Amino acid sequence: FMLELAILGLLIESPMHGYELRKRLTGLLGAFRAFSYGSLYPALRRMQADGLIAENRRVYQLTDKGRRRFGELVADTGPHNYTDDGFGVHLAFFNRTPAEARMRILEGRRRQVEERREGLREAVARTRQLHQLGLESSEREVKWLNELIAAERA
Amino acid sequence: FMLELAILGLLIESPMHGYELRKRLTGLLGAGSLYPALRRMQADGLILTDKGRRRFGELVADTGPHNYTDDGFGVHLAFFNRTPAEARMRILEGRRRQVEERREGLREAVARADRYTRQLHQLGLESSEREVKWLNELIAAERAA
C-alpha cells in the first residue's frame, strides 16, 4: 500500500524514468541505499497490469485509473499509515491529503508514538542506556506531533 | 529470528513461568505468546538445561547481522554481562555501521528541501546522532582495559 501510494504520488507530480523513481523512493524513506530494484520493478509490472501506470529504464506515466487510485489512497487513514515508513510516505503527500484525513493520520501516528514512549518509560523502570535514548526521541516526536495537531485545528 | 537467546538468557537467571518471561521479554520494547518457541525449545532439550547452558554460550558469542537490528541489538546488549569482550566489540561496531547508514540517509534526506517531512527527518537525524555518539563512548570504554 505504502509502496503504491509512494509510486502513484510521485508519478502524479510528473512522468519519470525508472532511475528517478528509485532515487525519489529512497528519498521518501531516508535509507542511504537505492530502493531495491527487485522490489520496485515487480510493483511496476503489477501496477501496469492493473492499469494504474503505462510505460513508454523507460519512462513511466500515470493513467486515469491511476489518478483515481491515488485519490483513494491519499484519503486513506488506516493503520498502514501510522508506521514509521507508512507515516513518512503519507506525510510527503499531505499537500494532496484532505484536512480530515490529515488530522486522523496525525492522531493515529500520535497513538503509535505515545505507546512506544509508554513501553520505553516502563522499560526504564529497572544496563540498557539505549531505552533512555529511545525515550527522549519519542518525547521529541510526540511534542512535534502535538504541535502539528494543534496547527491543523487552527 | 533468534528469539531463543532472549529466552535462554532470561531462563538461566531464575527458571520462571510466563509471569516474568513475557513480562521481561516484553520489556525489550514495550506495550506476545513465546509459547510455541518454549514447546520447541523444550523438545530440543534446551529448557534451562545443560544443553541449554551450552546453546546460550554459542548464541551470546554470535556477532552476525541478526545482532545489529534494533531488537537484535537491545536483546544482545541485555546479556553483555555474559558476552566475550571480542564479541561485544564486534556487535557494537556492527550496530554502529547500521546507525551510521541510517544517519546518512537522513542527513541526505534533510538536504533535499515540504517543511513537514523535513522536520521529521531532522528529528530522525538528531536521534541517530545521539545514538552514534553513545556507541562511540561505549566502544571507547571497551578498548580501555
Coordinates of C-alpha atoms in Angstrom, one line a residue:
Chain A
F1 CA 0.0 0.0 0.0
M2 CA 2.7 2.4 1.1
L3 CA 4.6 1.4 -2.0
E4 CA 1.7 2.1 -4.4
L5 CA 0.9 5.4 -2.6
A6 CA 4.6 6.4 -2.9
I7 CA 4.7 5.4 -6.6
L8 CA 1.4 6.9 -7.6
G9 CA 2.1 10.1 -5.5
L10 CA 5.5 10.6 -7.2
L11 CA 4.2 10.0 -10.7
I12 CA 1.3 12.5 -10.2
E13 CA 3.9 15.2 -10.0
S14 CA 5.3 14.4 -13.4
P15 CA 6.2 11.3 -15.6
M16 CA 9.5 9.7 -14.6
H17 CA 12.2 7.2 -15.7
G18 CA 13.0 4.2 -13.5
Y19 CA 16.2 5.8 -12.2
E20 CA 14.3 8.9 -11.0
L21 CA 11.6 6.8 -9.2
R22 CA 14.2 4.7 -7.3
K23 CA 16.0 7.8 -6.3
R24 CA 12.9 9.6 -5.2
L25 CA 11.6 6.4 -3.5
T26 CA 14.8 6.2 -1.5
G27 CA 14.5 9.9 -0.6
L28 CA 11.0 9.4 0.8
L29 CA 12.3 7.0 3.4
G30 CA 15.9 8.2 4.2
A31 CA 17.6 4.8 3.6
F32 CA 21.1 5.7 2.5
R33 CA 20.5 3.0 -0.1
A34 CA 18.9 2.7 -3.5
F35 CA 15.4 1.3 -3.1
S36 CA 15.9 -2.3 -4.3
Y37 CA 15.2 -2.9 -8.0
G38 CA 13.6 -6.3 -7.4
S39 CA 11.2 -4.6 -5.0
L40 CA 10.4 -1.7 -7.4
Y41 CA 10.2 -3.3 -10.8
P42 CA 7.7 -6.1 -9.9
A43 CA 5.4 -3.4 -8.4
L44 CA 5.6 -1.5 -11.7
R45 CA 4.8 -4.7 -13.7
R46 CA 1.8 -5.3 -11.4
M47 CA 0.8 -1.6 -11.4
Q48 CA 1.0 -1.7 -15.2
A49 CA -1.3 -4.8 -15.3
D50 CA -3.9 -3.2 -13.0
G51 CA -3.9 -0.2 -15.5
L52 CA -2.6 2.3 -13.0
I53 CA 0.6 3.1 -15.0
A54 CA 1.9 3.0 -18.6
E55 CA 5.4 2.6 -19.9
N56 CA 7.0 4.3 -22.9
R57 CA 14.9 2.1 -17.7
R58 CA 11.9 3.5 -19.6
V59 CA 9.6 6.5 -18.8
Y60 CA 6.5 5.7 -16.6
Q61 CA 3.3 7.7 -16.6
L62 CA 0.1 7.6 -14.5
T63 CA -3.3 6.5 -16.0
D64 CA -6.7 8.0 -15.4
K65 CA -7.4 4.9 -13.3
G66 CA -4.0 5.8 -11.7
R67 CA -5.1 9.3 -10.9
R68 CA -8.3 7.9 -9.3
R69 CA -6.5 5.2 -7.3
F70 CA -4.1 7.8 -5.8
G71 CA -7.2 9.9 -4.8
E72 CA -8.4 6.9 -2.9
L73 CA -5.1 6.2 -1.2
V74 CA -4.3 9.8 -0.1
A75 CA -7.7 9.8 1.6
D76 CA -6.9 6.5 3.4
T77 CA -6.2 6.8 7.2
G78 CA -5.9 3.0 8.1
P79 CA -3.2 1.6 10.5
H80 CA -1.0 1.2 7.4
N81 CA -0.4 5.0 7.7
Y82 CA 0.8 5.1 11.3
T83 CA 4.0 3.0 10.9
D84 CA 7.4 4.8 10.5
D85 CA 7.6 4.3 6.8
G86 CA 3.8 4.5 6.3
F87 CA 3.7 7.9 8.0
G88 CA 6.7 9.4 6.2
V89 CA 5.3 8.3 2.8
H90 CA 1.8 9.8 3.5
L91 CA 3.3 12.9 5.1
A92 CA 5.0 13.6 1.8
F93 CA 1.6 13.9 0.1
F94 CA -0.1 15.9 2.8
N95 CA -0.3 18.5 0.0
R96 CA -3.0 16.4 -1.6
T97 CA -4.5 14.9 1.7
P98 CA -7.9 16.2 2.9
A99 CA -7.9 18.1 6.2
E100 CA -10.0 15.4 7.8
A101 CA -7.6 12.6 6.7
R102 CA -4.5 14.6 7.7
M103 CA -5.9 15.0 11.2
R104 CA -6.8 11.3 11.5
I105 CA -3.3 10.2 10.3
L106 CA -1.6 12.6 12.7
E107 CA -3.6 11.2 15.6
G108 CA -3.0 7.6 14.6
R109 CA 0.7 8.3 14.4
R110 CA 0.5 10.1 17.8
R111 CA -1.2 6.9 19.2
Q112 CA 1.7 4.8 17.9
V113 CA 4.5 7.0 19.2
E114 CA 2.7 7.5 22.5
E115 CA 2.5 3.7 23.0
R116 CA 6.2 3.4 22.1
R117 CA 7.0 6.1 24.7
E118 CA 5.0 4.2 27.3
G119 CA 6.8 0.9 26.7
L120 CA 10.1 2.8 26.9
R121 CA 9.2 4.6 30.2
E122 CA 8.1 1.2 31.5
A123 CA 11.3 -0.3 30.2
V124 CA 13.5 2.2 32.1
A125 CA 11.8 1.1 35.4
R126 CA 14.6 -1.4 36.1
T127 CA 22.2 -1.7 31.7
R128 CA 20.0 -0.6 28.7
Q129 CA 21.0 3.0 28.3
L130 CA 19.6 2.8 24.8
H131 CA 16.0 2.8 26.2
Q132 CA 16.7 6.3 27.6
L133 CA 17.8 7.4 24.1
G134 CA 14.7 5.7 22.6
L135 CA 12.6 7.6 25.2
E136 CA 13.9 11.1 24.5
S137 CA 13.3 10.6 20.8
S138 CA 9.7 9.6 21.4
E139 CA 9.3 12.6 23.6
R140 CA 10.6 14.9 20.9
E141 CA 8.3 13.3 18.3
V142 CA 5.2 13.4 20.4
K143 CA 5.9 17.1 21.2
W144 CA 6.2 17.6 17.5
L145 CA 3.0 15.8 16.6
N146 CA 1.1 17.8 19.1
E147 CA 2.4 21.0 17.5
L148 CA 1.3 19.6 14.2
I149 CA -2.1 18.6 15.5
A150 CA -2.5 22.0 17.2
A151 CA -1.8 23.7 13.9
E152 CA -4.4 21.7 12.0
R153 CA -7.2 22.6 14.4
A154 CA -6.4 26.3 14.0
Chain B
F1 CA 14.6 -14.7 14.4
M2 CA 17.0 -16.0 17.1
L3 CA 14.3 -15.5 19.8
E4 CA 16.0 -18.2 21.9
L5 CA 18.9 -16.1 23.1
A6 CA 16.3 -13.9 24.8
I7 CA 14.6 -17.0 26.4
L8 CA 17.8 -18.9 27.3
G9 CA 19.4 -15.7 28.6
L10 CA 16.5 -15.0 30.8
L11 CA 15.7 -18.5 31.9
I12 CA 19.1 -19.5 33.4
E13 CA 18.9 -16.5 35.7
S14 CA 15.9 -18.0 37.6
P15 CA 13.7 -20.5 35.7
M16 CA 10.2 -18.9 36.0
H17 CA 6.9 -19.3 34.1
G18 CA 5.0 -16.9 31.8
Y19 CA 5.0 -14.4 34.8
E20 CA 8.4 -12.7 34.2
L21 CA 9.1 -14.4 30.8
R22 CA 6.5 -12.4 28.8
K23 CA 6.9 -9.5 31.3
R24 CA 10.6 -9.3 31.0
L25 CA 10.6 -10.4 27.3
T26 CA 8.1 -7.6 26.6
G27 CA 10.4 -5.2 28.4
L28 CA 12.7 -5.3 25.3
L29 CA 10.4 -2.6 23.6
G30 CA 7.0 -2.4 25.4
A31 CA 3.2 -2.3 25.2
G32 CA 3.1 -11.8 22.8
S33 CA 3.0 -15.6 23.2
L34 CA 6.5 -17.1 23.4
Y35 CA 4.7 -20.4 24.0
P36 CA 5.4 -22.2 20.6
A37 CA 9.1 -21.3 21.0
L38 CA 9.0 -22.8 24.5
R39 CA 7.3 -26.0 23.2
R40 CA 10.0 -26.3 20.6
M41 CA 12.8 -25.3 23.0
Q42 CA 11.5 -28.0 25.4
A43 CA 11.5 -30.6 22.6
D44 CA 15.1 -29.9 21.6
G45 CA 16.1 -30.2 25.3
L46 CA 17.1 -26.6 25.9
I47 CA 14.6 -26.0 28.6
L48 CA 17.5 -24.1 31.4
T49 CA 19.1 -27.5 30.7
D50 CA 22.8 -28.3 30.4
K51 CA 22.3 -28.4 26.6
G52 CA 20.5 -25.1 27.2
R53 CA 23.6 -23.6 29.1
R54 CA 25.8 -24.6 26.1
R55 CA 23.4 -23.3 23.5
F56 CA 23.3 -19.9 25.2
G57 CA 27.1 -19.9 25.3
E58 CA 27.0 -20.3 21.5
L59 CA 24.4 -17.6 20.9
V60 CA 25.9 -14.9 23.3
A61 CA 29.2 -15.4 21.3
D62 CA 27.4 -14.8 18.0
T63 CA 28.0 -11.5 16.2
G64 CA 26.1 -12.0 13.0
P65 CA 23.9 -9.3 11.2
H66 CA 21.0 -10.6 13.3
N67 CA 22.6 -8.8 16.3
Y68 CA 22.7 -5.3 14.7
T69 CA 19.0 -4.6 14.2
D70 CA 17.1 -2.6 16.8
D71 CA 15.5 -5.6 18.5
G72 CA 18.6 -7.8 17.9
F73 CA 20.9 -5.3 19.5
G74 CA 18.8 -4.5 22.6
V75 CA 18.3 -8.2 23.3
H76 CA 22.0 -9.0 23.0
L77 CA 23.0 -5.8 24.9
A78 CA 21.0 -7.2 27.9
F79 CA 23.3 -10.2 28.1
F80 CA 26.6 -8.2 27.6
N81 CA 27.3 -9.5 31.1
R82 CA 27.9 -12.9 29.6
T83 CA 29.2 -11.8 26.1
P84 CA 33.0 -12.2 25.5
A85 CA 34.9 -8.9 25.1
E86 CA 35.7 -9.7 21.4
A87 CA 32.0 -10.4 20.5
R88 CA 30.9 -7.3 22.4
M89 CA 33.2 -5.2 20.4
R90 CA 32.1 -6.7 17.1
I91 CA 28.4 -6.2 17.9
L92 CA 28.9 -2.6 18.9
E93 CA 30.7 -2.0 15.6
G94 CA 28.0 -3.8 13.6
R95 CA 25.4 -1.7 15.3
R96 CA 27.4 1.5 14.7
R97 CA 27.5 0.6 11.0
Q98 CA 23.8 0.3 10.9
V99 CA 23.1 3.5 12.7
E100 CA 25.8 5.3 10.7
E101 CA 24.0 4.4 7.5
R102 CA 20.6 5.4 8.9
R103 CA 22.1 8.8 9.8
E104 CA 23.5 9.2 6.3
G105 CA 20.2 8.5 4.6
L106 CA 18.6 11.0 7.0
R107 CA 21.2 13.7 6.5
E108 CA 20.8 13.2 2.8
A109 CA 17.0 13.4 3.2
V110 CA 17.1 16.7 5.1
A111 CA 19.5 18.2 2.4
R112 CA 16.7 18.0 -0.2
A113 CA 14.5 20.9 0.9
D114 CA 7.9 20.3 2.1
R115 CA 8.6 21.6 5.6
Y116 CA 6.9 18.7 7.5
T117 CA 8.8 15.8 6.1
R118 CA 12.0 17.8 6.7
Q119 CA 11.3 18.2 10.4
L120 CA 10.5 14.6 10.9
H121 CA 13.7 13.6 9.2
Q122 CA 15.5 16.2 11.3
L123 CA 14.1 14.5 14.4
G124 CA 15.3 11.1 13.0
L125 CA 18.7 12.6 12.4
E126 CA 19.3 14.0 15.9
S127 CA 18.3 10.7 17.3
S128 CA 20.8 8.8 15.2
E129 CA 23.5 11.4 16.1
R130 CA 22.8 10.8 19.8
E131 CA 23.0 7.0 19.3
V132 CA 26.2 7.1 17.3
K133 CA 27.8 9.4 20.0
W134 CA 26.7 6.9 22.6
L135 CA 28.1 3.9 20.7
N136 CA 31.4 5.6 20.3
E137 CA 31.6 6.2 24.0
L138 CA 30.6 2.6 24.6
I139 CA 33.2 1.4 22.0
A140 CA 35.9 3.7 23.6
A141 CA 35.2 2.2 27.0
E142 CA 35.6 -1.4 25.8
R143 CA 39.0 -0.7 24.4
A144 CA 40.3 0.7 27.7
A145 CA 41.4 -2.2 29.9

